[PDB]
Write a protein that binds this DNA or RNA. Structure first.
Ligand SMILES: [Mg+2]
Ligand SMILES: [Mg+2]
Ligand SMILES: [Mg+2]
Ligand SMILES: [Mg+2]
Ligand SMILES: [Mg+2]
Ligand SMILES: [Mg+2]
Ligand SMILES: [Mg+2]
Ligand SMILES: [Mg+2]
Ligand SMILES: [Mg+2]
Ligand SMILES: [Mg+2]
Ligand SMILES: [Mg+2]
Ligand SMILES: [Mg+2]
Ligand SMILES: [Mg+2]
Ligand SMILES: [Mg+2]
Ligand SMILES: [Mg+2]
Ligand SMILES: [Mg+2]
Ligand SMILES: [Mg+2]
Ligand SMILES: [Mg+2]
Ligand SMILES: [Mg+2]
Ligand SMILES: [Mg+2]
Ligand SMILES: [Mg+2]
Ligand SMILES: [Mg+2]
Ligand SMILES: [Mg+2]
Ligand SMILES: [Mg+2]
Ligand SMILES: [Mg+2]
Ligand SMILES: [Mg+2]
Ligand SMILES: [Mg+2]
Ligand SMILES: [Mg+2]
Lengths: 139, 135, 131
RNA sequence: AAGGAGGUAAAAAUGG
RNA sequence: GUCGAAGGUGGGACAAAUGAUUGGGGUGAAGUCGUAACAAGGUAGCCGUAUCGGAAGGUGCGGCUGGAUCACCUCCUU
RNA sequence: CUGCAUUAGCUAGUUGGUAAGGUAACGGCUUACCAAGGCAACGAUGCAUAGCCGACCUGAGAGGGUGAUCGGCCACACUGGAACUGAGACACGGUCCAGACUCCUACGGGAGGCAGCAGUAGGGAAUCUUCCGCAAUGGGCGAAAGCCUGACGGAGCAACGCCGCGUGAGUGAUGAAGGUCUUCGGAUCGUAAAACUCUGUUAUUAGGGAAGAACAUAUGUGUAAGUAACUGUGCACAUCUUGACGGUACCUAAUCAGAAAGCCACGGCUAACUACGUGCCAGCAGCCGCGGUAAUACGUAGGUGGCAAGCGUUAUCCGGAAUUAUUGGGCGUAAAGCGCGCGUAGGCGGUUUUUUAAGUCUGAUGUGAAAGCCCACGGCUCAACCGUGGAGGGUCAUUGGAAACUGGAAAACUUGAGUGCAGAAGAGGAAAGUGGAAUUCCAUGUGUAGCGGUGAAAUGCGCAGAGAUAUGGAGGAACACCAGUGGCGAAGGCGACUUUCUGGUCUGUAACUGACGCUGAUGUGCGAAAGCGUGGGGAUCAAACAGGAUUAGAUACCCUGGUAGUCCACGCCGUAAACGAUGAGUGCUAAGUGUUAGGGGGCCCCUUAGUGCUGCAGCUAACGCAUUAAGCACUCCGCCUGGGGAGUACGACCGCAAGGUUGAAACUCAAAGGAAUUGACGGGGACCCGCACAAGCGGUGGAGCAUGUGGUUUAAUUCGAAGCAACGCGA
RNA sequence: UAAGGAACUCGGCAAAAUGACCCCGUAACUUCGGGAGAAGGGGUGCUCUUUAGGGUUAACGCCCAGAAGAGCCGCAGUGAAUAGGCCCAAGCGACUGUUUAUCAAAAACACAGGUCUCUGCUAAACCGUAAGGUGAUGUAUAGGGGCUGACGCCUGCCCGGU
């Protein structure tokens, strides 16, 4: 890892030398990916980086960023009571989770009647859902 | 003090510290050592890019980058302006000037230098954010 | 113990002037007497008497107050001290209060005022300021 | 009569 | 043949980097436990020292007033 | 002419002498011999960093920072050593050797050193052309023409800096369109624009076109030394010829306002305000801060402000910062007086007389290069710039003068400091001995069922006889009353009495010495309590600890026990809010009133040394201090420089240990602090009042019932009111 | 005993190496004694010349014993023999000692030190049926027994059971 800056500089110089060789960072996987015209092309470039630029590198299959989804619908409840110590906290929600049409993305609906959930906290509930979904639930 | 006391032990002035220590140091790779040299800016590579929460009473998601400088010192540099195109491994220029809200952020990333892009849609005080004249 | 008789004399004069005393008795010495004579000649004090008794003698100064009880001596400052002695050249002689005051000096030509030092073109040890 | 200094008793539940 | 750079061998000195692991320090958001200090802060507080206790701290000995206070006597000032 | 003591010892050819050798030269420069010298707290040695200066930046100055360009001096030429040649080198583009690195090779063997000018790669935020000419100045060689000269003279690039000039000027209300705001009238951009007139600095085109050039040489004469006389040589006057820059600067003529304005800021500091969007988000920010629907602080727009071919940001230095204070600050409570003595070096030192001239003062001479800064003048059209004079800059040196002060030498004095003589008080210290009160324990007589303790209790002790009471014994520890802003001591501290040894202080006197004094780094001692070691001792009290209580819990406060320890000897430790939070010495500056130990003159007056209170002048941020200064002054020491980190880490020294002394930094905050003011509050106080107690009459609490409330129940038992100030209350 | 040098092996077992004298020089740590012969180096024969000394003697003489220089010889000079291998770390036991005569020498025993306990003298403890003895011709700073085991810093809670 001490040669990562050398690796970046070598990649820049090699991209200037060779239009068809590309290097980019993938945000989701945090990996640096090199794209080329073929196995021979990438092998030659890897050896050239190792020797000419003195940065020994290892190459592998790029990681695939998977996702998660719910296959079944269900009404669920979440309650949190923390009155025991010092400041007391209370929260409660009833949410129906449904498998959305594939590719439609997350959809939050507010079927609150009678102000049982004050309108102030509904955006907070949506944000909490967004964060908890950003964090995986299965893998 | 008496004049004799001053003759024996002369007066001693307070020593002044820099607000941007990381800019005062260069690195010689051949000798593998540090050297004292004042630079107005230093190049670096963004080790991390993200957001930080300011200390109270302020509240925000302030954009910053952890940068390793050309002298191998790792610092936190604020990203000024609205919107930026910086990621890990981006090569950026860093100048002095801390962000009072952000505790460990003591430098700024220059806009419109090296990889960093100018602020999109900026029209007043453009030179401070590296935005070309729209005309 | 005592280390600066001239400073002691100046402080005696200052304290007596503050309390608005009329006379002031102190142990005598030649330098003190010359200082007192310069003060009289310049008009800061009224009279100087020497008592040639035993034990080095006594100086008896008589202070001078103007109309409205205003004090003629505004202030006295020791300049040269045992801990640090001050000398000046003839061309570097200082003016006290833009000339309204005197600097008592000690020179090869006797202890004189700054005006006389400048006139005779001599320097020396700046004993004191009086204004 | 009002202020300053030394010694010296007796009393005592708990939480705001 | 003398002198003699570089070199070799040896035990020490000093400096820097780095090291499984480890110690307290600072900062940080509504965290958890209690409430030590500020009123006599509900056991006056603090200082040095010793020891004990999750924690602040408690306790002992000597010291300080930078301590509130009802009755008493003893003096000093106007 | 530099930083560090968290570097105190260094030196053995080292220091001196003798002899020789060696060198341009003196010399431990080298060798042989003899000696043990030499340096160092006036900082040696070690470590770290550094080319030095003229100067440059900043500052009112004193000072602080810097050592580019240009000039001087030094040092070096891949690294290390050496010598050769030479007048000169231990030699950048020389030699030899060694070393690292690199290159060529036919594999036998060879070669190289850009910190010369360009340029390449690399490092970096960042710094230029592989250009022209020797025409000018300078250099080497040559008799000379001349050759060489990446010195140099030029050109090229870069807003990098400074300076100069542009991007137009006059008129122009008819306040045109259009933007922004609006109170929907208008305001503003704005004489700005449009339009008419004018100019060409600049720009394009076409012509003319410098200086920098002196020369050298060559050719003519004239003159001067020498010659027997020429050629020649020196000098003087004339003539041909010599330009990279460059057909550049500059000048002239014509054409066009036409090609030539951007940057930052507008909450306060700080010059400049409004509308929309956003809504603690996005974002701003040098500090204070701004942003959650009315944002002059975020983004845009109009307008405005400052500058302008530049404007902003970052970095670094000086200033503001008197915030290390010589100029020019402090230490009672803000940071700061060592816990206190004794005392070394050093710093400082009473009065008079004579002498010296080291400091001190004054005159002359030399020097402080040039450039630079400052003043003046002159030349570029101006200016920058260039040139020429002046002035400045030394703690400089040599020399001649003065003697007041400081310093040195000599001689006197008694005022400071000690001594003698006559007196005073004292819990000053050390060691032995005696004594009364009281606590605990042991034994015994009497005696019965509690004692003890607390807010209230319980643990515990006691029917085996406790507790109470009387007597005797054992032992340890402290000295009731006197006792007092009283005494003594440097501080810590010292309180029964007696004896021995011993320290200090105060009063009067004026024989005696004659300045012998003050302070005091380093050092050396004393130093409350706790604590450590060895050996004793052990009543009381009491950390730890056990039990009881309180409490939500109670590792406490309270109660019952209880070990170390508390006591003694000898060692150790060396710290405390070791405080007057106030260093020592000295003198001077209104007063009133106590008290301790004295003295003098008539209960009074005066007086010395302490110890208190009150209080002027003066001081102080204020509180307050005020002859026992925190006033006015002089000498010396110690100490401080925002709050945390931290009295921590590392190093060192000390200690048996506990720990002590010395003592940072990274990082972090914009405060932390002092004195005083007004409120509020207190499980602070004093006083005053009230059917608040007290006095008294009658009630409620007990019974049945009425009613309201809580609870429960119900399909619902509608909702509201909850201490006084909810409950026959909204009703 | 070529080249190698622990590759052997459970293990460097055995062997090899070191070894004398003189000179230089010598670390952590430490209870300040030590560690230490630490380590790591240099010298060593013979001849001749010059030359400071000491003992014994009138002296000569005899004996001891250095220093400097210049030379000579070999592969090699404590020329043979005899004469430490060294170092860095960890466990255990403080140490010198003691032990299974004849398979165990150790970390086991002992130890100086610590502590508990008994014992007032015809002591307690011990031998003996007793007499008589040891303890001791000692007397609590003494004597017996148990446990611990130099030294440093320490040794907490439980007395219900035995
Ligand atoms: Mg409390
Ligand atoms: Mg309290
Ligand atoms: Mg306790
Ligand atoms: Mg250097
Ligand atoms: Mg200034
Ligand atoms: Mg050369
Ligand atoms: Mg070269
Ligand atoms: Mg070059
Ligand atoms: Mg680069
Ligand atoms: Mg200053
Ligand atoms: Mg303080
Ligand atoms: Mg003190
Ligand atoms: Mg000059
Ligand atoms: Mg004690
Ligand atoms: Mg107790
Ligand atoms: Mg202290
Ligand atoms: Mg103090
Ligand atoms: Mg008095
Ligand atoms: Mg073999
Ligand atoms: Mg062999
Ligand atoms: Mg093996
Ligand atoms: Mg094997
Ligand atoms: Mg063996
Ligand atoms: Mg053993
Ligand atoms: Mg056996
Ligand atoms: Mg055996
Ligand atoms: Mg054992
Ligand atoms: Mg035990």
């Amino acid at each position: 890892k001490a040669d990562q800056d050398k690796m970046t500089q070598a990649l820049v110089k090699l991209q200037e030398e060779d239009p068809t060789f590309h290097a980019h960072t993938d945000e989701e996987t945090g990996q640096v990916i090199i794209g080329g015209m073929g196995e021979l092309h990438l092998d030659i470039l890897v050896d050239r980086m190792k020797k000419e630029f003195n940065v020994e590198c290892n190459v592998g299959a790029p990681m695939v960023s998977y996702r998660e989804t719910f296959k079944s619908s269900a009404q669920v409840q979440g309650k949190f009571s923390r009155q025991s110590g010092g400041r007391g906290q209370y929260g409660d929600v009833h949410i129906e989770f449904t498998p959305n049409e594939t590719g439609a993305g997350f959809e939050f609906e507010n079927a609150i009647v009678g102000g049982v959930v004050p309108r102030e906290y509904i955006p907070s509930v949506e944000a909490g859902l967004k964060d908890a979904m950003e964090n995986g639930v299965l893998a | 003090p008496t004049i004799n006391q001053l003759v024996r032990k002369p007066r001693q002035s307070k020593i002044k510290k820099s607000d941007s220590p990381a800019l005062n140091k260069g690195f010689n790779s051949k000798k593998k050592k540090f050297t004292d040299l004042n630079s107005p800016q230093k190049r670096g590579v963004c080790t991390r890019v993200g957001t930080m929460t300011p200390k109270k009473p302020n509240s925000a998601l302030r954009k910053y980058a952890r940068v390793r400088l050309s002298n191998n010192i790792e610092i936190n540099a604020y990203i000024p302006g609205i919107g930026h195109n910086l990621q890990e491994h981006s090569v950026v220029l860093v100048r002095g000037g801390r962000v009072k809200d952000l505790p460990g952020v003591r430098y700024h990333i220059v806009r419109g230098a090296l990889d960093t892009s100018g602020v999109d849609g900026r029209r007043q005080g453009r030179s401070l954010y590296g935005t070309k004249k729209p005309k | 113990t005592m280390t600066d008789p001239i400073a002691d004399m100046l402080t005696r004069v200052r304290n007596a002037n503050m309390v608005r005393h009329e006379k002031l008795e102190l142990p005598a010495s030649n330098i003190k007497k010359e200082i007192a004579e310069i003060l009289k000649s310049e008009g800061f004090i009224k009279n100087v008497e020497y008592v040639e008794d035993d034990k080095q003698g006594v100086l008896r100064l008589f202070l001078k107050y103007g109309q409205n009880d205003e004090r003629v001596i505004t202030g006295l400052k020791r300049i040269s001290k045992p801990g640090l002695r001050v000398y000046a050249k003839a061309s570097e002689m200082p003016k006290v209060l833009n000339g309204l005051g005197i600097a008592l000096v000690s020179t090869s030509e006797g202890v004189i005022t700054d005006k006389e030092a400048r006139k005779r073109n001599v320097g020396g040890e700046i004993i004191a300021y009086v204004w």
